[PDB]
Symmetry: none
Subunit: 65 residues, 4 copies
């Protein structure tokens, strides 16, 4: 009994920590994903600007002729 109860209390506590850690990690995996999503939207906006500015320069050179 004595070895069996000790291990039962050990593993129950072990799992108790993993579960807490697992839920803590959901929060961290959620935060990091959104941060990435913010960095993707920043890139997407700049990609539009680069396309526009090149077009404006192309039009302005063409108007110069």
């Amino acid at each position: 009994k004595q070895e069996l109860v000790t291990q039962n209390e050990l593993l129950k506590q072990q799992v108790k920590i993993f579960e807490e850690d697992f839920q803590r990690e959901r929060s961290d995996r959620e935060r990091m994903n959104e941060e990435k999503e913010e960095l993707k939207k920043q890139v997407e906006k700049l990609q539009a600007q680069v396309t526009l500015t090149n077009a404006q320069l192309k039009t302005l050179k063409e108007e110069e002729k």
Copy 2:
């Protein structure tokens, strides 16, 4: 007495399988975190370079418009 130990034995094996799965999840969760952090460092580097392209082409606009 015998039932209580059988119940523990059974419970202890289920917990050693639960511990095994959480430890597999852990190292799996580490590699994802590593992957997603690197992707952020690539996306930040893109922004640096994309901002550079905007300032480059806006400078070119400035110079033409003033030279005109």
Copy 3:
């Protein structure tokens, strides 16, 4: 200047190979430091929870003494 270019292009081709090897080395170092920061973040959450844990025990003790006063 033809042979000068042939010599230089070979030597630059070697230099680009080293730069490319430096780059993947810089990736590995960046990745090591980023996870070390994530290992430190989780330690902060662990430590804060432990502060919370003891402060609860403090509060309970003090509150339980208030009743017995």
Copy 4:
């Protein structure tokens, strides 16, 4: 062939220029990250002091009974 070598030569020199510019950019980013790690170290060190302090206040408070 010499035309082909001069093109090649310009591209390799370009390649090198970008590697040398990425090199120097990375130094700043690593230095930034390395300080951000120091800020997180300092926050661990502060909290470890509080964990030690709270445990010791709990111990003396129980002794006060």
